[PDB]
């Protein structure tokens, strides 16, 4: 229950047991800080949050002192100002004059709080000099200049509590205390880059960005993170035509201040191996060509080949917008085809879970609902490589709650205790009608998280039928207040695809295609496209799909267009263009409209407003931006789509396999990254730097 207290004369109210700094933040009172973070545990080592309380003789730490009723706080008086001055004097005693060569310059809390709450000049002139500290090698992503460490312990707290990487610590004692791995080890985690943002000094910095830019040079665009279906909200920092870095953004219901390393460091791939001009295959060579010539060639291929009905195949890959897929589907249907297809292994056939109700392919117990969790079952998903931030959320819940977690699948090096109980469908049914089934039944907020790798199997109906039966049989998993059936997607376009109906007929499932338009589709195998078919790759990077193509149309990347992306929850988010596309590249729906007009059809929209109206005509949830909708048809969906048409399928005994064999190098932008290549050579479990011999 809330209490009442006074801070600088202002009366404010927060819950009991809260820290004083939280009250000061609610009251609009600014209090300094280096070691306090809203998402990390409370440490009281910087001694910069000191304020005066009438109760206490000495000044007390706002970060740690509990809030009490009737307490009177002052953050204004001479003792507090002198305290801040003294603490900054000691802090900058042994700090190095690296401000020109430091990459935190211009965005340093130490600089700003020295200017605001500290002295104008120093009194340290000792002839013996300052302390020195040797630089650590903790990997190819985080660069270390550890003379600048102020010993806040944010890195350690993050790595040991939020990430599950206990290799970072606090070795030594006193002035010779050094943060790092006591021996040369790597900071092996898919969340390591947030250490760079948490350090208020430049002791831990981005290595590929090391000296590229300063903060004031940068345009800051608030956009959305492709590379996973979490829809992490990001800030793209751009210097003209070049995207310099990507950093996280606050969204407490999606990603909560964090982003993974792919999202942060795959930006290096938007400036190499890009497609800047159209290309025509004349033989074993690609020949650069104009837009008119390439679209002319596509039209002539359509008229020479005469694909009847479902012989025109449309493939959409990861990292594609919704607008592009809608335009491609409208075109493909105007040409008489229903062979809209995903780049997954079993993408030629529609999903076993069906697309009739959105509840069947979404994370219905929303990302903030993991915090409500009491029991979790993980079917065919490693959340550390699929939606790592959601794995961090699962950990966060597990550390503060009674949370019992099980998994049916490959044995996964998890950041929590996971209770592995099988790898087959047999073991799934065993678990669901044995012990963990009753664990799920007696729970008040149980979660059954199914992976997309299950949909990428032939015997997926067997699974989804089993899980659907268990769901409709168990009230606790599906109520009028809570839905525990969740499907975790690993790529950012699948939810929007299924929302717009980007799946194939079964009439088209068995057709051999004569033309194959593949859009951002880099996971094709060279067996899903015939040797005698005319193929059209539309993308932004040449990795796999453009090698196959007969015509290549350069498109725009997610940093170069304002697209709509649907995440796992069903949350539609709108990006924002940071730059324009390079060279002769174009927005992709405009490409599809032009090539429609070159062909014997034409889409009825001509600018972005009409495309938004078409999105509304397809699904009105695609324009309710950032709103996660409930659904009224949970019972109906589990009875119609998951349990009904899947009883005919018989299970395999092939063990479940991991879906993402390398977290790094998952898509075109990452496979074109050299930083991801270095991070794939390193961060391999076979290396001695990445395994501590416990």
């Amino acid at each position: 229950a809330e209490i009442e207290l006074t801070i600088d004369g202002h009366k404010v109210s927060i819950e009991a047991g809260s820290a004083l700094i939280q009250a000061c933040e609610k009251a609009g009172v600014t209090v300094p800080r280096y070691c306090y973070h809203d998402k990390l545990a409370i440490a009281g080592n910087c001694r910069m949050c000191l304020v005066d309380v009438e109760r206490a003789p000495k000044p007390v730490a706002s970060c740690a002192y509990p809030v009490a009723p009737g307490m009177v706080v002052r953050t204004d008086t001479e003792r507090v100002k002198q305290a801040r001055e003294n603490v900054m004097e000691m802090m900058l005693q042994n700090h190095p004059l690296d401000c020109p060569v430091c990459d935190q310059g211009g965005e340093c809390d130490l600089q700003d709080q020295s200017m605001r709450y500290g002295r104008d000049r120093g009194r340290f002139t000792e002839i013996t000099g300052k302390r020195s500290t040797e630089d650590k090698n903790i990997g190819p992503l985080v660069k270390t200049s550890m003379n600048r460490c102020i010993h806040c312990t944010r890195c350690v707290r993050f790595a040991n509590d939020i990430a599950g990487a206990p290799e970072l610590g606090s070795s030594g004692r006193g002035n010779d205390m050094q943060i790092g791995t006591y021996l040369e080890k790597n900071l092996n985690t898919e969340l390591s880059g947030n250490v760079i943002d948490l350090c208020p000094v430049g002791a831990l910095t981005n290595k590929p960005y090391a000296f590229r830019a300063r903060p004031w040079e940068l345009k800051k665009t608030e956009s959305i993170d492709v590379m996973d279906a979490v829809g992490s909200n990001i800030r793209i920092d751009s210097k003209g035509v070049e995207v310099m870095r990507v950093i996280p953004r606050v969204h407490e219901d999606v990603n909560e201040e964090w982003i993974n390393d792919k999202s942060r460091f795959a930006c290096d791939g938007l400036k190499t191996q890009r497609l800047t001009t159209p290309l025509i295959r004349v033989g074993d060579k690609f020949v650069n060509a104009t837009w008119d010539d390439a679209l002319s060639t596509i039209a002539k291929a359509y008229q020479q080949k005469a694909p009847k009905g479902d012989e025109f195949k449309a493939v959409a890959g990861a990292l594609v917008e919704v607008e592009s897929m809608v335009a491609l589907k409208d075109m493909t249907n105007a040409l008489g085809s229903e062979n809209t297809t995903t780049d997954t292994p079993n993408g030629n056939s529609a999903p076993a879970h069906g697309i009739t109700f959105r509840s069947n392919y979404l994370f219905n117990s929303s990302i903030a609902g993991i915090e409500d969790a009491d029991a979790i079952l993980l079917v065919g998903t490693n959340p550390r490589r699929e939606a790592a931030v959601m794995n961090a959320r699962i950990r966060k819940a597990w550390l503060r709650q009674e949370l019992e977690i099980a998994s049916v699948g490959p044995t996964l090096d998890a950041t929590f205790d996971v209770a592995e109980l099988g790898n087959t469908h047999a073991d799934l049914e065993k678990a669901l009608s044995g012990e963990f089934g009753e664990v799920l039944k007696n729970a008040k907020n149980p979660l059954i998280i199914v992976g997309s790798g299950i949909t990428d199997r032939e015997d997926a109906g067997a699974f989804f039928n089993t899980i659907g039966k268990f769901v409709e049989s168990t009230p606790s998993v599906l109520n009028e207040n809570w839905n525990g059936y969740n499907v975790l997607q690993r790529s950012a376009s699948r939810a929007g695809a299924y929302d717009i109906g980007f799946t194939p007929s079964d009439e088209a499932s068995k057709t051999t295609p004569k033309m194959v338009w593949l859009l951002g589709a880099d996971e094709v195998a060279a067996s899903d496209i015939p040797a005698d078919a005319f193929v059209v790759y539309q993308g932004h990077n040449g990795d796999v799909g453009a090698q196959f193509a007969d015509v290549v149309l350069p498109g725009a990347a997610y940093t170069e267009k304002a697209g709509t992306y649907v995440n796992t929850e069903g949350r539609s988010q709108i990006s924002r263009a940071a730059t324009g596309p390079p060279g002769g590249a174009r927005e992709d729906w405009k490409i599809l409209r032009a090539v429609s007009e070159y062909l014997g059809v034409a889409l009825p929209y001509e600018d972005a407003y009409e495309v938004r109206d078409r999105l509304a005509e397809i699904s009105p949830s695609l324009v309710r931006y950032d709103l996660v909708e409930p659904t009224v048809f949970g019972d109906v969906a589990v009875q119609h789509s998951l349990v009904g048409p899947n009883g005919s399928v018989t299970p395999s005994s092939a063990p479940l396999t991991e879906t993402i064999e390398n977290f790094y190098m998952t898509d075109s932008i990452s496979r074109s990254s050299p930083t991801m290549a270095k991070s794939s050579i390193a961060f391999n479990k076979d290396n001695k730097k990445n395994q501590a011999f416990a």
Partner: protein
């Protein structure tokens, strides 16, 4: 100065195996029993000392073996072994001379003792002799400030020192039997004044049973 970084060597690296002997493993299980079952990490300090006594110094393999035993990450053990200075993380000599140079032992003559030891062994604090016999280290107060100046050789306190006595003490620890601990040459017993006790002079103590309250 405290060293807080490890660089692997051919005789100190995690590939070198380590294992408690059966005696020390029994003792370690008895030590783990002294704490709650879920808080067995509390035994990281005594078990590390057990390792440092089996093998003459706290090597990285000892830390990793303890971490394996107590189900704790190795870095949490590295932090302990680096924080507490009695964990010798470099190899040591047979005899670890620890001479206090704090203010009491300085007022009573620690610097003469340090000069004597440095001249006898031709060694500076933090170094080891050619004999692998004497490792020297100037330490803070070891809790024998009344019997000052003082020193400690491998866990035993030799007190109320002189340069003469320290020189010949090192001589007989270099070869032959080493004297029993306590004040030098029995010029004192323990904390008594060296002229003699002035307080506790009977030959039978007063039993407090004779002086209880009116209650009980």
């Amino acid at each position: 100065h405290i060293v807080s970084v490890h660089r692997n060597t051919e005789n100190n690296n995690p590939s070198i195996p380590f294992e408690f002997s059966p005696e020390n493993m029994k003792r370690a299980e008895e030590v783990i029993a002294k704490y709650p079952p879920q808080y067995k990490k509390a035994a990281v300090m005594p078990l590390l000392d057990i390792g440092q006594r089996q093998l003459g110094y706290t090597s990285i393999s000892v830390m990793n073996y303890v971490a394996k035993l107590l189900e704790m990450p190795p870095m949490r053990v590295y932090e302990v072994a680096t924080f507490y200075t009695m964990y010798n993380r470099t190899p040591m000599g047979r005899y670890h001379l620890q001479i206090c140079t704090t203010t009491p032992c300085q007022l009573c003559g620690s610097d003469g003792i340090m000069e004597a030891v440095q001249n006898t062994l031709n060694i500076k604090p933090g170094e080891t002799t050619k004999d692998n016999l004497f490792t020297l280290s100037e330490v803070e107060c070891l809790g024998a400030c009344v019997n000052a100046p003082m020193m400690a050789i491998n866990d035993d306190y030799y007190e109320d020192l002189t340069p003469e006595g320290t020189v010949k003490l090192l001589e007989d620890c270099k070869a032959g039997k080493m004297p029993t601990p306590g004040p030098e040459n029995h010029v004192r017993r323990d904390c008594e004044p060296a002229s003699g006790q002035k307080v506790l002079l009977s030959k039978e103590p007063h039993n407090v049973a004779d002086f209880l309250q009116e209650g009980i």
